[PDB]
Design a protein around this ligand. Structure first.
Ligand SMILES: [Br-]
Lengths: 301, 301
């Protein structure tokens, strides 16, 4: 029993984190085989921030301008190249701790673990969701550039996020490991801001199923609704539309609990229209949308 | 910016987890130097559960009755002994991944990271607090016996918790690594139940400071209160008493924010008496008490 925001064990990723310094800028890199991946922002000066031309900035660099340190061991950079918003630093040494891995771009609504890192040293690990507006509500301080997000399936680490920057509302933006930004954000100084966000409906339903599996049943009711009628209420409360594919994905949880998805939707409609009346669900007084159906199955019986 | 339930990186502990089997019971053990620590419940049969005499059960065992597996490598047990509610299995091989470590018993109100494990394989990592009633609100399924809680300071892992059992309310009880239970719980079948719990006041104040550091200020007010008067309100709402030592511990956060502790106490009093009026603090609609002052300083600027 119990239900927590649970991250994947971080060991496999910890052994890949390195420190990358260029000029007076230090940030984190990811060392896999004989390549170190890091944010291309590492080649910028605080002066260049307005509208840097990274192709120019990079042509003016040499391998010896990049100091890469894996713990107490310096790695010799033997090649460099830019891929979108990341840098690929070829080093003379393959990481002996390289796990089986993949680079996988996630969807809004998906979750992942974040290994927050400073000066190449991991500091903490926590779970995040990619918001509908392609930001993440992370916890990052100065120096966290290059920290990575990932999931683990069996033995294989699927890297999905590399951290770049913090937006004015305190939320975070970054790239996939191919260097392509999540959302309409750029690695130069602008007034860019998080767009309007919505609540991830399928996840809220998954979390209600988790609550039922864990003995919180007070919000259940005898009613059922139609997908159409529920989506009318969802729109009104700034919730994402629920699709038949979502309903199908919730199948296993519906079967485990004996509660049809559209029955659970009737409970969510009530909760949206009346609130909780001072009660809580899984220790929360709000509807929690950062657990996927997979996360629930992973943690619940 | 940002504030999350953040666990310590789990790698150092992952390399210590092993599988221990005796009879048909399998659970997790902790392999440090040439000793494997695990719950003594591993020597029980479902028949013995009512009132086992563990000294008798252990005399009837031999080293060869304990199958210990570190991944794909079997460890040969060369000695066994009981220490309170844990077993110490001496093995022929010292763990080459043993980190610098300590066994440290924590106080109610303190937090720690949990590496939930099944069949010796780590599954997830999350943060927990030791409740005033000496339970923890964990997330554990069958097979999680022997999972460990820990903190990390610099390079040294301070192990503070080994998981044993789940109480009827779905909360969890276990021991320190010397095998001494936290709280009035025993490793035999009884009607034992979590005692009445309280809210960890110093932690709630720490979290309010985190909120201010992160730009949530709506709950602040011009008022200040006395320690005595605040503790009168605390008692009424089932909050722990606030001590001068707590006030001193909150010193650094008070100084960083410019908000005196007794001023923040006036805000908490208001929140207790009126609620939040539909607003949230750090993404929560409840007063969160599982962040210590240290946790806040660790994560905030
Ligand atoms: Br909440």
């Amino acid at each position: 029993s119990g239900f927590r925001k649970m991250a994947f064990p971080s060991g496999k990723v910890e052994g890949c984190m390195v420190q990358v310094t260029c000029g007076t800028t230090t940030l984190n890199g990811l060392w896999l085989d004989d390549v170190v991946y890091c944010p291309r922002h590492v080649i910028c000066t605080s002066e260049d921030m307005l509208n840097p031309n990274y192709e120019d900035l990079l042509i003016r660099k040499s391998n010896h301008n990049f100091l890469v340190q894996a713990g107490n061991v310096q790695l010799r950079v033997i090649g460099h190249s830019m891929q979108n918003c990341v840098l690929k630093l070829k080093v003379d040494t393959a990481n002996p701790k390289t796990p089986k891995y993949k680079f996988v771009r996630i969807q809004p609504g998906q979750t992942f673990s974040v290994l927050a890192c400073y000066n190449g040293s991991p500091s903490g690990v926590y779970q995040c969701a990619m918001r509908p507006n392609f930001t993440i509500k992370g916890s990052f301080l100065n120096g966290s550039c290059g920290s990575v997000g990932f999931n683990i399936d069996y033995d294989c680490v699927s890297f999905c996020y590399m951290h770049h920057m913090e937006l004015p509302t305190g939320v975070h933006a970054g790239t996939d490991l191919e260097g392509n930004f999540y959302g309409p954000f750029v690695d130069r100084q602008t007034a860019q801001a998080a767009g309007t966000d919505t609540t991830i409906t399928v996840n809220v339903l998954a979390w209600l199923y988790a609550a039922v599996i864990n003995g919180d049943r007070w919000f259940l009711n005898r009613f059922t609704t139609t997908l159409n009628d529920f989506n009318l209420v969802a729109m009104k409360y700034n919730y994402e539309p629920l699709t038949q594919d979502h309903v199908d994905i919730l199948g296993p949880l519906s079967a485990q609990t004996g509660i049809a998805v559209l029955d659970m939707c009737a409970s969510l409609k009530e909760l949206l229209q009346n609130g909780m009346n001072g009660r809580t669900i899984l220790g929360s007084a709000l509807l929690e949308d950062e657990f996927t159906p997979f996360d629930v199955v992973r943690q619940c019986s």
